[PDB]
Amino acid sequence: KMRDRLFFLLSKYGIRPRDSIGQHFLIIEDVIEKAIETANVNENDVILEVGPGLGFLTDELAKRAKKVYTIEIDQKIIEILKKEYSWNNVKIIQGDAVRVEWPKFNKVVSNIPAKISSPFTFKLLKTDFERAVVMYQLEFALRMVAKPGSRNYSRLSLMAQALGNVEIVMKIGKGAFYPRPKVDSALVLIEPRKDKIVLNENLVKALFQHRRKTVPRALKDSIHMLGVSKDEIRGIINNVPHSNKRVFQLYPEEVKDIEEYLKKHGIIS
Ligand SMILES: CSC[C@H]1O[C@@H](n2cnc3c(N)ncnc32)[C@H](O)[C@@H]1O
Numbered sequence: 643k644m645r646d647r648l649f650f651l652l653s654k655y656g657i658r659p660r661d662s663i664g665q666h667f668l669i670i671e672d673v674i675e676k677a678i679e680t681a682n683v684n685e686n687d688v689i690l691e692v693g694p695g696l697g698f699l700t701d702e703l704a705k706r707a708k709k710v711y712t713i714e715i716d717q718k719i720i721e722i723l724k725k726e727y728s729w730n731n732v733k734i735i736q737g738d739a740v741r742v743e744w745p746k747f748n749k750v751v752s753n754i755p756a757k758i759s760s761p762f763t764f765k766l767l768k769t770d771f772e773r774a775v776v777m778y779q780l781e782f783a784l785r786m787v788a789k790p791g792s793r794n795y796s797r798l799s800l801m802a803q804a805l806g807n808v809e810i811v812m813k814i815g816k817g818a819f820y821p822r823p824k825v826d827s828a829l830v831l832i833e834p835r836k837d838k839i840v841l842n843e844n845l846v847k848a849l850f851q852h853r854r855k856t857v858p859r860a861l862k863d864s865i866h867m868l869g870v871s872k873d874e875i876r877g878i879i880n881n882v883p884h885s886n887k888r889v890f891q892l893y894p895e896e897v898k899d900i901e902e903y904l905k906k907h908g909i910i911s
């Protein structure tokens with residue numbers, strides 16, 4: 643039915659779905675049911691959706707969460723949400739997710755467009771949110787989960803796991819979307835820790851500049867010498883914790899050890 647009642651909108655408005663803003667549209671139910679379940683949505687939550695589109699999922703959220711904000715960029719999409727659905731606990735914000743100032747919320751339940759997967763999730767990792775089920779391009783999802791020292795483990799993976807537990811819940815075929823995306827999606831639960839490891843953003847950013855460097859090399863190359871003088875950094879680099887690891891091998895905990903060690907040698911405070 644969801645299959646058919648999608649197409650019965652596309653004749654009514656006639657969007658040619660641009661994969662310039664990642665317009666692929668879901669037509670399986672047991673995906674929407676897996677998100678709603680995984681997020682475990684009760685009616686005190688203030689969900690944040692993003693990229694609702696035709697808004698099948700937005701509908702499911704709005705019939706539960708006490709308030710659901712949602713952010714949409716194609717205006718054409720947004721006037722279809724106001725006409726097709728009638729909601730009194732949904733606030734569609736016009737504009738792009740990256741820039742528009744976010745409201746307050748506790749959970750996040752959303753498909754996320756590929757092109758703003760990265761800057762979204764970094765902004766999210768800097769919020770106080772209870773929980774997040776989020777759908778991703780597989781290559782990206784695999785990144786969030788990636789174990790330290792693995793092929794694709796990156797600054798994203800680190801910052802995500804340094805805040806929380808990050809599990810894939812299901813992989814999602816392209817046949818569940820119209821039009822067909824080139825690559826599968828994957829539904830990614832993020833349960834935050836109740837003892838988040840809090841990494842110095844700059845440090846992490848400097849370390850992950852070339853993330854296949856040795857920790858000593860990455861520091862020699864990316865530590866800015868604003869305070870430290872010449873022959874002391876040679877000493878300070880010798881005893882840095884985990885000096886035998888490549889950056890992309892570091893756990894959050896070990897980035898914290900390096901951060902402290904640097905702190906106490908007067909580099910960053
Ligand atoms: C659910 S398929 C993608 C949906 O997300 C929307 N979208 C794409 N990019 C953005 C963005 N930057 N901000 C908000 N919605 C977006 C698209 O217009 C479409 O409705």
Ligand SMILES: [Zn+2]
Pocket residue numbers: 851852853854855
């Ligand atoms: Zn490099």
